[PDB]
Design an enzyme around this catalytic site. Structure first.
Site, PDB file in Angstrom:
ATOM      1  N   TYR A 102       0.824  -1.192   0.000  1.00 38.06           N
ATOM      2  CA  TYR A 102       0.000   0.000   0.000  1.00 38.06           C
ATOM      3  C   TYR A 102       0.866   1.253   0.000  1.00 38.06           C
ATOM      4  O   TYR A 102       2.036   1.252   0.405  1.00 38.06           O
ATOM      5  CB  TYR A 102      -0.928   0.045   1.217  1.00 38.06           C
ATOM      6  CG  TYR A 102      -0.208   0.256   2.516  1.00 38.06           C
ATOM      7  CD1 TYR A 102      -0.075   1.529   3.077  1.00 38.06           C
ATOM      8  CD2 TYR A 102       0.369  -0.801   3.214  1.00 38.06           C
ATOM      9  CE1 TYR A 102       0.604   1.757   4.257  1.00 38.06           C
ATOM     10  CE2 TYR A 102       1.052  -0.597   4.412  1.00 38.06           C
ATOM     11  CZ  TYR A 102       1.172   0.673   4.939  1.00 38.06           C
ATOM     12  OH  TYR A 102       1.826   0.801   6.131  1.00 38.06           O
TER      13      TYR A 102
ATOM     14  N   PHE B 127       2.147   9.714   3.627  1.00 34.63           N
ATOM     15  CA  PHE B 127       2.530   9.431   4.988  1.00 34.63           C
ATOM     16  C   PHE B 127       3.120   8.071   5.188  1.00 34.63           C
ATOM     17  O   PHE B 127       3.810   7.889   6.216  1.00 34.63           O
ATOM     18  CB  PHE B 127       1.365   9.690   5.976  1.00 34.63           C
ATOM     19  CG  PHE B 127       0.167   8.796   5.800  1.00 34.63           C
ATOM     20  CD1 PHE B 127       0.103   7.503   6.401  1.00 34.63           C
ATOM     21  CD2 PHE B 127      -0.934   9.170   5.084  1.00 34.63           C
ATOM     22  CE1 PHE B 127      -0.992   6.695   6.160  1.00 34.63           C
ATOM     23  CE2 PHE B 127      -2.032   8.370   4.948  1.00 34.63           C
ATOM     24  CZ  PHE B 127      -2.026   7.150   5.518  1.00 34.63           C
ATOM     25  N   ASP B 128       2.900   7.089   4.307  1.00 35.10           N
ATOM     26  CA  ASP B 128       3.523   5.797   4.499  1.00 35.10           C
ATOM     27  C   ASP B 128       3.415   4.992   3.211  1.00 35.10           C
ATOM     28  O   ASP B 128       2.510   5.188   2.396  1.00 35.10           O
ATOM     29  CB  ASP B 128       2.873   5.031   5.683  1.00 35.10           C
ATOM     30  CG  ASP B 128       3.774   3.912   6.242  1.00 35.10           C
ATOM     31  OD1 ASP B 128       5.038   4.138   6.211  1.00 35.10           O
ATOM     32  OD2 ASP B 128       3.243   2.884   6.646  1.00 35.10           O
TER      33      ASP B 128
ATOM     34  N   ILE C 117      -7.379  -0.197  10.754  1.00 29.91           N
ATOM     35  CA  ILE C 117      -8.528   0.707  10.730  1.00 29.91           C
ATOM     36  C   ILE C 117      -9.724   0.036  10.024  1.00 29.91           C
ATOM     37  O   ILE C 117      -9.592  -0.819   9.141  1.00 29.91           O
ATOM     38  CB  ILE C 117      -8.190   2.055  10.071  1.00 29.91           C
ATOM     39  CG1 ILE C 117      -7.608   1.919   8.666  1.00 29.91           C
ATOM     40  CG2 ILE C 117      -7.260   2.873  10.992  1.00 29.91           C
ATOM     41  CD1 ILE C 117      -7.520   3.250   7.926  1.00 29.91           C
TER      42      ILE C 117
ATOM     43  N   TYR D 150      -8.914   7.088  11.874  1.00 30.21           N
ATOM     44  CA  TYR D 150      -8.377   7.449  13.196  1.00 30.21           C
ATOM     45  C   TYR D 150      -9.243   8.492  13.916  1.00 30.21           C
ATOM     46  O   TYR D 150      -8.849   8.933  15.015  1.00 30.21           O
ATOM     47  CB  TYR D 150      -6.904   7.867  13.096  1.00 30.21           C
ATOM     48  CG  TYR D 150      -6.031   6.729  12.661  1.00 30.21           C
ATOM     49  CD1 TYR D 150      -5.574   5.791  13.590  1.00 30.21           C
ATOM     50  CD2 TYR D 150      -5.643   6.563  11.338  1.00 30.21           C
ATOM     51  CE1 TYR D 150      -4.790   4.727  13.206  1.00 30.21           C
ATOM     52  CE2 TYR D 150      -4.867   5.500  10.940  1.00 30.21           C
ATOM     53  CZ  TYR D 150      -4.424   4.577  11.860  1.00 30.21           C
ATOM     54  OH  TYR D 150      -3.657   3.536  11.438  1.00 30.21           O
TER      55      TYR D 150
ATOM     56  N   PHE E 227      -5.744   5.640   0.119  1.00 33.49           N
ATOM     57  CA  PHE E 227      -4.794   4.567  -0.089  1.00 33.49           C
ATOM     58  C   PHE E 227      -4.892   3.990  -1.486  1.00 33.49           C
ATOM     59  O   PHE E 227      -5.982   3.863  -2.057  1.00 33.49           O
ATOM     60  CB  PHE E 227      -5.066   3.362   0.860  1.00 33.49           C
ATOM     61  CG  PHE E 227      -4.870   3.691   2.324  1.00 33.49           C
ATOM     62  CD1 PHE E 227      -3.620   3.499   2.910  1.00 33.49           C
ATOM     63  CD2 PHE E 227      -5.922   4.137   3.092  1.00 33.49           C
ATOM     64  CE1 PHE E 227      -3.438   3.775   4.277  1.00 33.49           C
ATOM     65  CE2 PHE E 227      -5.740   4.410   4.454  1.00 33.49           C
ATOM     66  CZ  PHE E 227      -4.477   4.209   5.037  1.00 33.49           C
TER      67      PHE E 227
HETATM   68  C1  LIG Z   1       3.096   0.867   9.407  1.00 38.32           C
HETATM   69  O1  LIG Z   1       1.673   1.053   9.633  1.00 38.32           O
HETATM   70  C2  LIG Z   1       0.983  -0.129   9.535  1.00 38.32           C
HETATM   71  C3  LIG Z   1      -0.508   0.137   9.571  1.00 38.32           C
HETATM   72  C4  LIG Z   1      -0.942   0.912  10.827  1.00 38.32           C
HETATM   73  N1  LIG Z   1      -2.369   0.677  11.164  1.00 38.32           N
HETATM   74  C5  LIG Z   1      -2.622   0.106  12.507  1.00 38.32           C
HETATM   75  C6  LIG Z   1      -2.177  -1.372  12.562  1.00 38.32           C
HETATM   76  C7  LIG Z   1      -1.998   1.017  13.570  1.00 38.32           C
HETATM   77  C8  LIG Z   1      -1.160   0.459  14.559  1.00 38.32           C
HETATM   78  C9  LIG Z   1      -0.690   1.377  15.526  1.00 38.32           C
HETATM   79  C10 LIG Z   1      -0.979   2.716  15.458  1.00 38.32           C
HETATM   80  C11 LIG Z   1      -1.741   3.157  14.368  1.00 38.32           C
HETATM   81  N2  LIG Z   1      -2.257   2.322  13.466  1.00 38.32           N
HETATM   82  C12 LIG Z   1      -3.419   0.788  10.314  1.00 38.32           C
HETATM   83  O2  LIG Z   1      -4.545   0.387  10.652  1.00 38.32           O
HETATM   84  C13 LIG Z   1      -3.302   1.438   8.953  1.00 38.32           C
HETATM   85  C14 LIG Z   1      -3.840   0.501   7.841  1.00 38.32           C
HETATM   86  C15 LIG Z   1      -2.842  -0.641   7.587  1.00 38.32           C
HETATM   87  C16 LIG Z   1      -1.469  -0.100   7.210  1.00 38.32           C
HETATM   88  C17 LIG Z   1      -0.943   0.873   8.274  1.00 38.32           C
HETATM   89  N3  LIG Z   1      -1.963   1.902   8.588  1.00 38.32           N
HETATM   90  S1  LIG Z   1      -1.736   3.394   7.964  1.00 38.32           S
HETATM   91  O3  LIG Z   1      -2.977   4.095   8.073  1.00 38.32           O
HETATM   92  O4  LIG Z   1      -1.102   3.281   6.690  1.00 38.32           O
HETATM   93  C18 LIG Z   1      -0.575   4.196   9.022  1.00 38.32           C
HETATM   94  C19 LIG Z   1      -1.050   4.919  10.114  1.00 38.32           C
HETATM   95  C20 LIG Z   1      -0.154   5.603  10.954  1.00 38.32           C
HETATM   96  C21 LIG Z   1       1.179   5.547  10.669  1.00 38.32           C
HETATM   97  N4  LIG Z   1       2.170   6.182  11.439  1.00 38.32           N
HETATM   98  C22 LIG Z   1       3.401   5.894  10.945  1.00 38.32           C
HETATM   99  S2  LIG Z   1       3.384   4.859   9.519  1.00 38.32           S
HETATM  100  C23 LIG Z   1       1.680   4.806   9.591  1.00 38.32           C
HETATM  101  C24 LIG Z   1       0.771   4.107   8.716  1.00 38.32           C
END
Ligand SMILES: COC[C@H]1CN([C@@H](C)c2ccccn2)C(=O)[C@@H]2CCC[C@H]1N2S(=O)(=O)c1ccc2ncsc2c1
Length: 128
Positions: free
Chosen positions: A45, A55-56, A75, A101, A118
């Site tokens: 993703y 952001f990621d 999420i 969030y 995304f």
């Molecule tokens: C590296 O991030 C992995 C994960 C983060 N999360 C959850 C698991 C999560 C875990 C802990 C804190 C916040 N969100 C999520 O539910 C969602 C959807 C899946 C992919 C990512 N995210 S995200 O939205 O891309 C995200 C959110 C915050 C963040 N902060 C630094 S990288 C990042 C990626």
């Protein structure tokens, strides 16, 4: 650009029909099967904020993001959206904050009340 297009032209995939999660299939995947609850799913993703900031990205890590579907490990918009995908599919997903969030955000990258965009590729899914 792509976020505007999914906002204006995407399909509402919420059961509530509240337009909280909108989707466009960008690359059609294989056959008809979608993952089931509890499957281990492997995804790549990239995520963007509504200010245009990336952001990621898992692509930048050279390994997929892996989770168990339908368990609240991600999420809400991702549990809903990935459940609709075929293997090999690429989609765009627009996620209102109630399916992301919320008012809390996620420190440091995600502000309060953030709509997220995304691009998601479902690489594989398997039961355990
Ligand atoms: C590296 O991030 C992995 C994960 C983060 N999360 C959850 C698991 C999560 C875990 C802990 C804190 C916040 N969100 C999520 O539910 C969602 C959807 C899946 C992919 C990512 N995210 S995200 O939205 O891309 C995200 C959110 C915050 C963040 N902060 C630094 S990288 C990042 C990626």
């Amino acid at each position: 650009g792509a976020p505007a297009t999914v906002t204006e032209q995407g399909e509402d995939i919420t059961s509530k029909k509240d337009r909280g999660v909108l989707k466009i299939v960008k690359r059609v995947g294989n056959g008809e099967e979608t993952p089931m609850i509890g499957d281990k799913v492997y995804v790549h993703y990239k995520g963007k904020l509504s200010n245009g900031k990336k952001f990621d990205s898992s692509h930048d890590r050279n390994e997929p993001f892996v989770f168990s579907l339908g368990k609240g490990q991600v999420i809400k918009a991702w549990d809903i959206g990935v459940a609709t995908m075929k293997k090999g599919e690429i989609c765009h997903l627009l996620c209102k904050p109630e399916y992301a969030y919320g008012s809390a955000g996620s420190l440091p990258k995600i502000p309060s009340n953030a709509t997220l965009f995304f691009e998601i590729e479902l690489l594989d899914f398997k039961g355990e």
